[PDB]
Amino acid sequence: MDPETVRIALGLEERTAAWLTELDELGPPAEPVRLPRGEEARDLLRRLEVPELDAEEIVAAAPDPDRDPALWWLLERTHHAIVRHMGDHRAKPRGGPPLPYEGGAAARYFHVYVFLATVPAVRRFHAERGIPDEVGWETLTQLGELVAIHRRKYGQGGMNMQWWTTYHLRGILYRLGRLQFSLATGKDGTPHLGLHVPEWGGPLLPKAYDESLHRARPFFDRHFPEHGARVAWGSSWMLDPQLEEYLTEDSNIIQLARFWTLTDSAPEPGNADGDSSILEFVFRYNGQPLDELPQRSSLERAVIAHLKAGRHWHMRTGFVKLP
Ligand SMILES: CC(C)(COP(=O)(O)OP(=O)(O)OC[C@H]1O[C@@H](n2cnc3c(N)ncnc32)[C@H](O)[C@@H]1OP(=O)(O)O)[C@@H](O)C(=O)NCCC(=O)NCCS
Numbered sequence: 001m002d003p004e005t006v007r008i009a010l011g012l013e014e015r016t017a018a019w020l021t022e023l024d025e026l027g028p029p030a031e032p033v034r035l036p037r038g039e040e041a042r043d044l045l046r047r048l049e050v051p052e053l054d055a056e057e058i059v060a061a062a063p064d065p066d067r068d069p070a071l072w073w074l075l076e077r078t079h080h081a082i083v084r085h086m087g088d089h090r091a092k093p094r095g096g097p098p099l100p101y102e103g104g105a106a107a108r109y110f111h112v113y114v115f116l117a118t119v120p121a122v123r124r125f126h127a128e129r130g131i132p133d134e135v136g137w138e139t140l141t142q143l144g145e146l147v148a149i150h151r152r153k154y155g156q157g158g159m160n161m162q163w164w165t166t167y168h169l170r171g172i173l174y175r176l177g178r179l180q181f182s183l184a185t186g187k188d189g190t191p192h193l194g195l196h197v198p199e200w201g202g203p204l205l206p207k208a209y210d211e212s213l214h215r216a217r218p219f220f221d222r223h224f225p226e227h228g229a230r231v232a233w234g235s236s237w238m239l240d241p242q243l244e245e246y247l248t249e250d251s252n253i254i255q256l257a258r259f260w261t262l263t264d265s266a267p268e269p270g271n272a273d274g275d276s277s278i279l280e281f282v283f284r285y286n287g288q289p290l291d292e293l294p295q296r297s298s299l300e301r302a303v304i305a306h307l308k309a310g311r312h313w314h315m316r317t318g319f320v321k322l323p
C-alpha cells in the first residue's frame with residue numbers, strides 16, 4: 001500500500017502525511033508483527049491489568065491483515081518506529097496519531113494492539129538488561145490503567161495515551177513501587193531520572209514514596225550503569241505551591257512537596273497553561289461545565305474554587321537528590 005491510501009482509508013488528517021511517509025520509508029519490522037489471539041491474548045491483557053470488559057472487546061475486535069489492510073500496514077510500521085528506539089531515551093516519544101473512531105473497535109484499540117505486538121520486544125530488552133520479571137511486568141501494567149482512563153474519560157473503550165506508552169515500550173521507564181522513573185537527560189546532556197506518579201496504586205503515602213526513592217539509584221546503577229543519574233526531576237501540577245492555600249497538613253502532596261526544590265521561576269498569574277493538566281489528573285476533564293464536576297474531595301473543591309475565583313494553576317518543576 002501507499003501512505004496516502006492508508007491516510008485516506010483510515011480518515012487521518014493531512015498533517016499526518018509526513019509521519020506516514022516516514023513510516024513508509026522505515027518499512028515493516030524484521031520480526032513480523034504478531035498479535036496474540038484468544039486465551040493467549042486474554043492471559044496477556046490480564047497480566048497487563050486491562051479490565052475484563054475492555055480485554056474481551058480488544059480480543060473480539062483484533063484486526064486482520066486481509067480485511068484491515070490499511071490498519072495492518074500502520075500497525076506493523078508503528079511497531080517498527082517504536083522498537084527502532086528500544087532503550088533510547090534521547091528519541092522523542094512518537095507513538096503515532098489516534099485513529100478516527102469511525103473505524104470501530106479496531107481503530108479505538110489500535111494502540112493497544114501496538115502495545116501487545118511490542119511486548120515480546122520490550123520483554124527481551126528487559127531480559128538483556130537483567131531487569132527482574134516482576135519489575136518488567138509491574139511497569140507494563142500501566143496499559144490497563146490507561147485503558148481504564150480512556151473509558152472513564154470518554155465513555156467507550158480505547159487508549160489514546162500512546163505517546164506515553166512509548167516510554168514503557170522502549171524500556172526507558174520502570175515502575176519501582178509507587179513511583180515510576182525514566183532515563184532522562186537535561187538540556188546540557190546531564191543524566192537524571194524523571195520521576196512520575198501513575199494513578200493506580202492508592203495514595204502517595206510517605207513510606208511508599210520513600211521506598212520508591214530508595215530503589216531508584218540501586219536499580220539504575222545495576223541495570224543501566226552507563227547512565228549515572230544522581231537527581232530525580234519532576235514537573236507536575238502537584239508541585240504548585242498554590243495548593244497550600246487549599247490542602248491541609250494531612251495531604252500527602254503537601255507533606256512530600258516540602259522535600260522538593262523548585263527550579264522554575266514563579267509563573268505569571270495570568271498564565272493559564274497549567275489549568276488543563278490539573279483538570280486532566282483530578283477529573284480526567286473532557287469539557288464539562290465546571291460546577292458539574294464532582295466535589296467530594298478537598299482537592300476537587302480546591303481546583304474548582306481556585307478557577308472560579310479567576311485564578312490559574314501552574315505546572316512546577318523541581319528536583320530531589322536520589323538517596
Ligand atoms: C498522586 C495521587 C495518588 C495523590 O493522591 P493522595 O496521596 O490521596 O494525595 P493527597 O493526600 O494530597 O490528597 C488530598 C485530598 O485530595 C484528594 N485527591 C488526591 N488526588 C486526587 C485526584 N487525582 N482526584 C481527586 N481527588 C484527589 C484526596 O482523596 C484527599 O481528599 P480529602 O482531603 O477530601 O480526604 C492522586 O492525585 C492521583 O492518582 N492522581 C493521578 C495521577 C497523577 O496526577 N500523577 C501526576 C501527573 S503529573
Ligand SMILES: CCCCCCCCCC(=O)OC[C@H]1O[C@@H](O)[C@H](N)[C@@H](O)[C@@H]1O
Nearest residue numbers: 164195196197234235236238253256257
Ligand atoms: C509531591 C510528590 C512528588 C512531586 C513530583 C511529581 C512528579 C510527577 C510527574 C508525573 O507524574 O508526570 C508524568 C506523567 O506523564 C503524563 O503525561 C502521563 N499521562 C502520566 O501518566 C505521567 O504521570
